[PDB]
Design a binder for this molecule. Structure first.
Ligand SMILES: CC[C@H](O)[C@@H](C)[C@H]1O[C@@H]1C[C@@](C)(O)/C=C/C=C(\C)[C@H]1OC(=O)C[C@H](O)CC[C@@](C)(O)[C@@H](OC(C)=O)/C=C/[C@@H]1C
Ligand SMILES: [Zn+2]
Ligand SMILES: [Zn+2]
Ligand SMILES: [Zn+2]
Lengths: 842, 66, 861, 91
């Protein structure tokens, strides 16, 4: 049939709508129509039909020719209405047909490249990788010589954009056919004396080669640098700039190996940073920055000492890009061995914090990020307190961006290195600065919260004297007009609960718990969840006995909050109720727990995973707290009265109760609920048994004999749903008690599971197969092979079918074990079947 | 299914099944060190020699079919 | 209701793989070895010339292929392992912590030593850019290896290189320099051989050498070049390529070594030199058992060992791109090895396939050798080959010897010397390198006494304490037979006149079979000998040589109520036994009187019987003898042994029998145990019990009157027990298996005993790979629950090193039942401290408490 | 109508949305996520990167086989991405 056509498809395959079916009417251009048909089947259509069309177009690729094939493909590729997945389908048909037609594409190479060269600079990353894949397939199809002959004239075009595009195309063909394939061509181009754009694009080719191939250029690194080294001292300025950038990219790709292959370009760069300025100096410094980490400690010391004066001079350049490059180079220098920290804190740090740590940098995003990361990395070598002291007093700056920048820096440094490096003065000014920065903030963003939490947790016990002021401020901010302020306060309490606990300030945290309890009536859901989390933290640090408010008053207040619809409130409230049920269970009555039970069964159906995990945990906690009998009874009655949608909740709860209160408290009542003559309640009991055994796992090792007679009755109950569910039960049974010595009981159950293999209903036969696979796992493949042998060969064809299905299952499952279990098949006149080696006796 | 060698159907001949399990056995001998050691002690041959013999017998372990 | 705890006392000492490299990342060259399911790191000290074991790790799997690789510009060598999981692993040894850090673990198939699931073969591009893991049939997988910004190894997705109905003999990566990586495989298609009922295709199909090329540009793998071979080869060797060598491969075959390379390179073949006046069978071929390469910045050479144990040095003559000839020179003679390693600083490590391993120092590389060197240029016709005479070693000097109990064939624990604590008497070794060793402990100390052939069983004389050992080997000559063969050779070679003096020199030359191998020849020849050995002094008090085709398989010393309290020794012997296909003439039972206080065998008579007597067991003044599938009671007559009672309903073939009271426990070769009752009143043997499972039982031990523990050919241990108060006059009784466990090594001896006096009674087993293990029962269920929790926690938190699942591993052929793996539990002390703290608080105690518990359970024995 | 990809899985980790966050791709079980799901390169390329392996929605966490499948080694059968054979790649 003809697949569907979207509007934009009409212009491309409209000729397929015409009903002139007869091929003799076609003037040998059925090839055109055949390609149109195949491409329409590939682009639009199910996986089977597009697979068939792809195979068809690949098997006939040479019979068609590259000409019409690409003259129909390329228009579709550059269409602005093309979807990304359609583009991928086109790229894959392209590379397959290109593999098929070897040199048939050579004349059209040019015509192809100009259509697909823009893809190499497209914003979409996948478009770029597809363009590179297409160029590489082209270079593998059409010879290297053809690629060179086709892309050579553009290397000295006056426009620079075409030069860049052909340079990256040459990089791609170098990746496709190997660097040594282009080594002589690039060596000749980089020294081309006729044009300077030629050598410019040549060393740009090697730069893009490094950028694209990464560490895979380490074998040819010395050859590439020997090809491009002369361009450093070339009198044209742009070519030496791009040769410096190419050296930078080569060092970046080769990290951390291959410094010895750079022994030539060290002296030219060293001279150039004294003989250059502007963008060329930036390029030279960037190359040296990516080059320094590869050096040995001694030579790193020497070379950094040589370049340090020039770079700290450039520290104060008007061009911000030069500032970014010198920031990266100081980060690269101080991150390596050899340059010791005393040198850094004597020479580099003062001008660094002079010219780089000014408020102007707190506005540009990338400058902000690079400055912060550079300072944090410096702290790893020079010392945490050494850097924190130079910027801590700036925490009290009224420019909010500057103080948030310094706050993030202090946060990351103290999270990396703790606080053992900090003395008393630095500690006090840290506390003062974080207090001011938290009190005077317009927005409620997480930088200040994270900084406060991390600095307090890093100080640890050292924070005892400042806790009264911290808690006064958090109490003052809890009573605020903005919800996102009290939310942040509650989150700070949640994060510093344990460090307050170690400081032994339990009365203050009790007051915090009381004000949170009285704020529990909050309307905004996110901040209510935050204060619930703070309450949970407080109840976790101080015990369930000395908790204020008492648990007796705290839990019934939480009970109605479970009906709130917001997921954050749900998760936090469930977690708090669960901690209470784990520890302070003795303080509330059994009926409050039963009401919470009723409102927890619903939350087992939450779509968010954490909410239902918490629900499971707290339900198990309260089931361990109160008696299993009452909840089990109401759950069994629920099992009877409930429909399928909410029956899964009650079965999961039954399994949870069986796991927390050992199953002999749940299995008797469940199994007796099976004797009622109604069959649907029997099926519900069977499904609950199935999930119970899957859920308890190894716990069910002591209960196979108990549930055995019910399964005997259910497996020949002449109701297909019952047999299917019972087979699922024994499957989960055997998979849960694997390796716990339940071989005899499961072998007994196997005899009742087996006769159901001759069933036709797909669901019940797949359930029986799953039961047999689990029984293979638990009993062993030898016994299942013993059961299969009696029917592997047999006059009846259908019994052969079923027994060969079972054999295939156990053979795929345990192919290597069967070696010891195959029967002794004697020889005959025609063949020899005895495995004589296994009969050897030493 | 069809992708996995050694599986069978209702038309699997005795010869096919037995040559499959014989090849499985020979590969398992190649794999398990102590099994091959037992074989190389029973027959007074080196481990390389018995491995070569097993790979040779892999071709027609039970004989030609009908 | 018995629960056991398993502990290895002496780990396996038999090496299956060995590779050398810079695993420490320094000047030092280490060797990692795969022995069974254990991975070990050893460091040879160049100053003292002695090997030290730095690291030992139980990986709980079956290592099938071991290889080392390095990336460009790197300093340390990684370890890539293929095992019986569906996983390939890459590891790095960290010397800071003395551990194997798992760098990568990639999953591709199901577990086990399967046929089509890769793991058996490993090859790696000589530059480290890719690695191919291959099955024996069909499927192969190539992984691309690279680094990142932080110099951390990264592995890609697998690339498929499958070819249906295709076997694989070997695969190695060809040194193509930095071109597209290529892997050379020895293959053979069986599709045509299967669909042809005559046999034309099977005989006409031939092995092929194929090259899978990895196009990194297009990023796929293509079957590029494939060519048949007129000779079927067994393995491949990569020759250096690119800059410092001519790319290509060496193919070792039967009676030849070939060089081949893709392109217009002519195949350069050369026959393998055969021994001068070899006593082996003239119609028996010759192949190489292992190879080793050593690269200099000036030259490179190869070392290849023959089945005979002769190591030859191989060099290739270079004419720019092409090679001109293959040159070979007889280097030396060491025991047959599974792996050889040529380190720097002039040291050669030889890992024997059986028995002790060695390390030599290279004194001279045999370049200034007066001995003739051979080459492919030398011409000859009629297929006559190059010859050479073996000589005592002088290129190498033995600098270290490592004791290896592999292969343990029999074991008995007893305090023969009055040390008040028992010792382990272990009949192990193989061929002329066989040995009876006495092991003590206070790891074990050992003393070794050499033997002639491979020992099968040995019994202890109660009054004298001496041992009656039987040693038997296949296709070997007896002493008289090798003497007469030497005589016939010397008399035939003088017909062609200095041949008289040459024959005198040949006959007066008796090279030690301990070093130059035993002159072995024939298809059904059997060299067998009985000996009586003192257990304290290595001296043998008497020795009895048997006929040329008589092979001893069972021995027992006992008295008879028929005669007095004088002793007797019975030996069962097969005649004209063929192993494959199996056919035998019959059996004989030799009866010796054993006089002079257990020091002299006095022959009495020699009874023929229908098949091979595989088991002899004393039985209240009579003996119990298993002849094929027949069980018989024999009394000592004055001219023969007269049958008194027979049972003919044993399944296949009796391998062993043990008696408790009047119960007889018969081991079948395939059908597990069979309980037989001897009714003394009526004089009849009645089968009354058997098993519900088949087991290839190798040994067995009686636990009590109802319980029997047995060992499997497939490395399993089981414990079966009869139902309570089973009546022996009612048949059709089945025994239930109360214990199942997989050791990972094939156990050949089980014995219930106490190693330290007064301590715990336990179950000691010995494996075929030289391992000593113990199973101890649990005193209280408190400890049992503790160790079950420890086992499950270590399973979840310290998974096996090569991607295997521990529970699945210990359930290899049967689901594990009532055994705790103490070898896994004791890896608690090698975890990261935070994981130790977590799993300890989960056990509600401190890590030192858990440690102390493990130490006390090990000292308890 | 719906079938598993079953191609050779690679180094891409399968993903799951919020609706299917705790489910097993093979047997739809929520009990004991054991080992990590790997998918083939073709099912992870393009706009399909990070999408749910089961339903195809936006992935929020990683996908796992259940322990029952791990025990039965059903995590060794290939790429478990569910593909619909009656839908083009634009639907
Ligand atoms: C009859 C089986 C069936 O599939 C139902 C569970 C399914 O129809 C529901 C749909 C839904 C939406 O209601 C799912 C609920 C799922 C729940 C409550 C599961 O916890 C989760 O999914 C959350 C986490 O990943 C895992 C939590 C953990 C470790 O506690 C686990 O415990 C064990 C022992 O596995 C508990 C498993 C729970 C059954
Ligand atoms: Zn599952
Ligand atoms: Zn997929
Ligand atoms: Zn989903």
């Amino acid at each position: 049939n003809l697949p569907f056509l979207k509007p934009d498809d009409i212009q491309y395959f409209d000729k397929l709508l015409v009903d002139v079916d007869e091929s003799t009417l076609s003037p040998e251009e059925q090839k055109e129509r055949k390609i149109m048909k195949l491409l329409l089947k590939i682009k639009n259509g199910t996986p089977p039909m597009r697979k068939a069309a792809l195979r068809q177009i690949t098997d006939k690729a040479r019979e068609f020719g590259a000409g019409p094939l690409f003259n129909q493909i390329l228009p579709l590729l550059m269409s602005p209405t093309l979807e990304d997945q359609e583009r991928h389908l086109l790229v894959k048909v392209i590379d397959r047909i290109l593999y098929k037609l070897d040199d048939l594409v050579r004349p059209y190479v040019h015509k192809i490249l100009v259509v697909i060269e823009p893809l190499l600079i497209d914003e979409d990353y996948y478009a770029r990788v597809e363009g590179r894949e297409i160029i590489s397939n082209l270079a593998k199809a059409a010879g290297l010589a053809t690629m060179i002959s086709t892309m050579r004239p553009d290397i000295d075009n006056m426009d620079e954009y075409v030069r860049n595009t052909t340079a990256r195309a040459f990089a791609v063909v170098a990746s496709a056919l190997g660097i040594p394939s282009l080594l002589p061509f690039l060596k000749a181009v980089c020294k081309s004396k006729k044009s300077w754009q030629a050598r410019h694009t040549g060393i740009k080719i090697v730069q893009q080669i490094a950028i694209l191939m990464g560490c895979a250029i380490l074998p040819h690194l010395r050859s590439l640098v020997e090809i491009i080294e002369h361009g450093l001292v070339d009198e044209q300025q742009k070519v030496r700039t791009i040769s410096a950038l190419a050296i930078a990219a080569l060092a970046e790709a080769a990290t951390p190996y291959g410094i010895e292959s750079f022994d030539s370009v060290l002296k030219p760069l060293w001279k150039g940073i004294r003989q250059h300025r502007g963008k060329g100096l930036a390029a030279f410094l960037k190359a040296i920055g990516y080059l320094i980490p590869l050096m040995d400690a001694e030579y790193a010391n020497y070379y950094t000492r040589e370049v340090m004066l020039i770079l700290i001079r450039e520290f104060q350049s008007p061009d911000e890009e030069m500032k970014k490059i010198v920031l990266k180079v100081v980060k690269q220098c101080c991150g390596t061995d050899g340059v010791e920290a005393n040198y850094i804190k004597t020479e580099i740090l003062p001008p660094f914090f002079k010219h780089f740590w000014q408020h102007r940098m707190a506005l540009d995003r990338r400058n902000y990020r690079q400055l912060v990361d550079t300072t944090v990395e410096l702290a790893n070598k020079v010392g945490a307190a050494e850097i924190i002291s130079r910027i801590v007093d700036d925490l009290k700056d009224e420019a909010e961006q500057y103080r948030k920048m310094v706050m993030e820096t202090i946060e990351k440094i103290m999270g990396n290195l703790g606080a053992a490096d900090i003395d008393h003065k630095l500690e006090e000014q840290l506390i003062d600065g974080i207090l001011y920065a938290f009190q005077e903030q317009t927005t409620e963003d997480s930088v200040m919260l994270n900084g406060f939490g991390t600095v307090v947790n890093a100080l640890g016990k050292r924070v005892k004297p400042y806790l009264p002021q911290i808690c006064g401020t958090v109490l003052w901010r809890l009573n605020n007009k903005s919800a996102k302020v009290r939310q942040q306060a509650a989150d700070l309490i949640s994060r510093t609960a344990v460090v307050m606990k170690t400081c032994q300030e339990e009365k203050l945290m009790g007051h915090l718990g009381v004000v949170l309890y009285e704020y529990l009536g909050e309307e905004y859901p996110e901040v209510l969840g935050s204060i619930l989390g703070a309450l949970k933290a407080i109840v976790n640090v101080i015990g369930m006995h000395k908790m204020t408010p008492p648990i007796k008053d705290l839990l019934p207040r939480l009970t109605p909050i479970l009906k709130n619809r917001h997921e954050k409130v749900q998760e936090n409230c469930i977690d708090l109720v669960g901690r209470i049920a784990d520890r302070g269970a003795e303080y509330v009555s059994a009926r409050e727990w039963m009401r919470i039970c009723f409102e927890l069964l619903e939350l087992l159906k939450a779509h968010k995973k954490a909410i239902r995990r918490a629900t499971v945990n707290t339900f198990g906690y309260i089931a361990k707290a109160i008696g299993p009998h009452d909840v089990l009874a109401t759950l069994l009655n629920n099992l009877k009265v409930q429909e399928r949608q909410n029956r899964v909740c009650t079965t999961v709860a039954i399994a949870i109760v069986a796991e927390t209160c050992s199953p002999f408290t749940v299995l008797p009542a469940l199994m007796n609920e099976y004797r009622v003559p109604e069959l649907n309640v029997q099926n519900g009991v069977l499904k609950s048994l199935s999930f119970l055994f899957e859920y308890i796992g190894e716990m069910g090792k002591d209960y196979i004999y108990a549930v055995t007679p019910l399964l005997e009755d259910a497996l020949m109950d002449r109701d297909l749903v019952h047999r299917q569910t019972a087979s699922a039960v024994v499957q989960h049974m055997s998979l849960g008690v694997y390796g716990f010595g339940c071989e005899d009981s499961l072998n007994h159950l196997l005899n009742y599971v087996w006769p159901n293999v001759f069933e036709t209903s797909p669901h019940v036969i797949q359930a029986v197969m799953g039961a047999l696979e689990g029984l293979r796992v638990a009993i062993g493949p030898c016994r299942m092979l013993q059961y299969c042998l009696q029917g592997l060969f047999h006059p009846a064809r259908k019994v052969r079918d079923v027994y060969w299905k079972i054999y295939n299952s156990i053979y795929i499952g345990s192919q290597d074990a069967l070696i010891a279990h195959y029967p002794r098949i004697y020889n005959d006149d025609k063949n020899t079947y005895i495995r004589y080696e296994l009969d050897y006796i030493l | 299914q069809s992708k996995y060698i050694g599986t069978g159907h209702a038309d699997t001949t005795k010869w096919e099944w037995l040559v499959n399990q014989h090849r499985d056995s020979y590969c398992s001998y190649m794999g398990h060190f102590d099994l091959l050691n037992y074989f190389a002690i029973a027959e007074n041959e080196s481990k390389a020699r018995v491995r070569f013999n097993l790979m040779e017998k892999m071709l027609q372990p039970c004989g030609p079919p009908a | 209701h018995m629960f056991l705890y398993n502990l290895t006392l002496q780990r396996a000492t038999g090496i299956s793989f060995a590779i050398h490299g810079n695993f420490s990342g320094t000047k030092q060259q280490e060797i990692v070895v795969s022995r069974g399911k254990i991975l070990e790191l050893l460091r040879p000290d160049p100053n003292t010339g002695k090997v030290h074991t730095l690291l030992t790790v139980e990986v709980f799997g079956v290592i099938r292929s071991l290889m080392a690789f390095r990336l460009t510009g790197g300093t340390k060598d990684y370890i890539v392992v293929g095992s019986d999981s569906g996983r390939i692993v890459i590891l790095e040894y960290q010397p800071s912590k003395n551990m194997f850090e798992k760098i990568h673990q990639e999953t591709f198939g199901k577990s086990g030593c399967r046929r089509i699931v890769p793991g058996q073969f490993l090859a790696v591009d000589p530059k480290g850019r890719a690695v191919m893991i291959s099955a024996i049939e069909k499927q192969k997988l190539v992984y691309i290896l690279n680094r990142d910004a932080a110099a951390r190894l990264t592995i890609s997705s697998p690339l498929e290189a499958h070819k249906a109905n295709t076997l694989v003999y070997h695969v190695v990566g060809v040194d193509v320099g930095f071109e597209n990586p290529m892997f050379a495989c020895l293959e053979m298609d069986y599709e045509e051989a299967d669909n042809d009922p005559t046999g034309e295709a099977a005989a006409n199909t031939q092995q092929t050498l194929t090259f899978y090329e990895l196009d990194l540009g297009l990023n796929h793998v293509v079957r590029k070049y494939s060519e048949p071979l007129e000779e079927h080869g067994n393995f491949l060797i990569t020759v250096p390529g690119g800059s410092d060598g001519p790319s290509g491969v060496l193919i070792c075959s039967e009676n030849y070594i070939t060089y081949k390379n893709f392109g217009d390179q002519p195949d350069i073949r050369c026959p393998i030199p055969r021994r001068r006046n070899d006593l082996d069978d003239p119609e028996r071929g010759m192949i190489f058992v292992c190879s080793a390469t050593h690269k200099t910045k000036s030259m490179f050479f190869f070392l290849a060992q023959t089945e005979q144990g002769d190591i030859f040095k191989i060099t290739l003559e270079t004419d720019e791109d092409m090679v001109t000839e293959i040159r070979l020179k007889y280097f030396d003679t060491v025991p047959v090895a599974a792996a050889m390693c040529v380190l720097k600083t002039g040291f050669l490590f030889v890992a024997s396939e059986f028995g002790n391993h060695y390390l030599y120092q290279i004194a001279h590389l045999g370049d200034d050798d007066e001995e003739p060197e051979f080459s492919s240029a030398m011409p000859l016709e009629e297929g006559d080959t190059f010859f050479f005479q073996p000589r005592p070693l002088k290129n190498l000097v033995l600098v270290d010897e490592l004791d290896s109990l592999s292969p343990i064939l029999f074991c008995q624990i007893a305090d023969l010397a009055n040390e008040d604590t028992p010792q382990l008497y272990v009949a192990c070794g193989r061929g002329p390198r066989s040995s009876l060793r006495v092991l003590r402990h206070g790891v074990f100390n050992q003393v070794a006494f050499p033997l002639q052939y491979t020992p099968r069983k040995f019994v202890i004389h109660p009054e004298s304490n001496n041992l009656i050992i039987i040693e038997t080997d296949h296709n070997a000559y007896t002493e008289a037979t090798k003497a007469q063969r030497k005589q016939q050779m010397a008399e035939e070679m003088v017909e062609a006149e200095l041949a008289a003096e040459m024959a005198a020199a040949f006959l007066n030359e008796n090279l030690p079979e301990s070093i130059f191998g035993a002159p072995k020849a024939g298809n059904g020849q059997w060299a067998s000998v009985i000996r009586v050995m003192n257990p304290i002094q290595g001296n043998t008090l008497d020795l009895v040589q048997l006929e040329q085709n008589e092979a001893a398989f069972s021995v027992a010393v006992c008295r008879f109520s028929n005669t007095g309290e004088d002793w007797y020794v019975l030996v069962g012997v097969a005649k004209d036994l063929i192993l494959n296909p199996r056919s035998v003439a019959g059996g004989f039972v030799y009866t010796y009187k054993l006089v002079n206080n257990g020091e002299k065998l006095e022959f009495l008579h020699k009874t023929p019987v229908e098949e091979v007597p595989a088991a002899i067991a004393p039985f209240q003044g009579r003996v119990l003898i298993g002849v094929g599938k027949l069980l018989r009671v024999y009394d000592l007559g004055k001219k023969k042994l007269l049958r008194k009672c027979e049972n003919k309903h044993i399944a296949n073939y009796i391998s062993g029998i043990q008696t408790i009271g009047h119960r007889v426990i018969v081991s079948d070769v395939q059908e597990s145990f069979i309980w037989v009752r001897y009714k003394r009143n009526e004089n009849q043997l009645i089968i009354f019990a058997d098993d519900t499972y088949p087991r290839w039982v190798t040994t067995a031990s009686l636990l009590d009157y109802d319980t029997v523990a047995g060992a499997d050919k497939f490395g399993n241990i089981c414990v079966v027990r009869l139902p309570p108060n089973t009546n022996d006059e009612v048949d059709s009784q089945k025994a239930e298996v109360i214990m199942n466990y997989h050791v990972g090594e094939t156990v050949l001896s089980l014995q219930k005993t106490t190693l330290i006096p007064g301590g715990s009674e336990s179950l000691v087993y010995t494996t075929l790979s030289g391992g000593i293990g113990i199973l101890v029962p649990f005193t209280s269920h408190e400890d049992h629950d503790f160790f079950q929790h420890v086992e499950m926690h270590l399973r979840s938190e310290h998974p096996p090193l090569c991607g295997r699942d521990h529970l699945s591993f210990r359930s290899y052929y049967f689901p594990v039942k009532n055994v705790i793996d103490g070898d896994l539990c004791e890896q608690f002390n090698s975890m990261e401290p935070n994981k130790q703290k977590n799993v300890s608080e989960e056990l509600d105690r401190t890590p030192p408490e858990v440690s102390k518990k493990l130490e006390d359970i090990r000292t308890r024995y | 109508d719906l079938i598993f990809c079953r191609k050779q899985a690679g180094v891409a980790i399968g993903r799951l949305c919020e609706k299917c966050d705790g489910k097993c791709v093979i047997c739809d079980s929520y009990v004991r996520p054991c080992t990590l799901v790997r998918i083939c390169d073709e099912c992870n390329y393009g706009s399909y990167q990070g999408r749910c392996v089961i339903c195809g929605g936006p992935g929020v966490s990683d996908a796992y086989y259940c322990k029952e499948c791990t025990i039965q080694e059903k995590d060794r059968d290939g790429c478990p991405k569910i593909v619909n054979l009656g839908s083009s790649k634009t639907d």
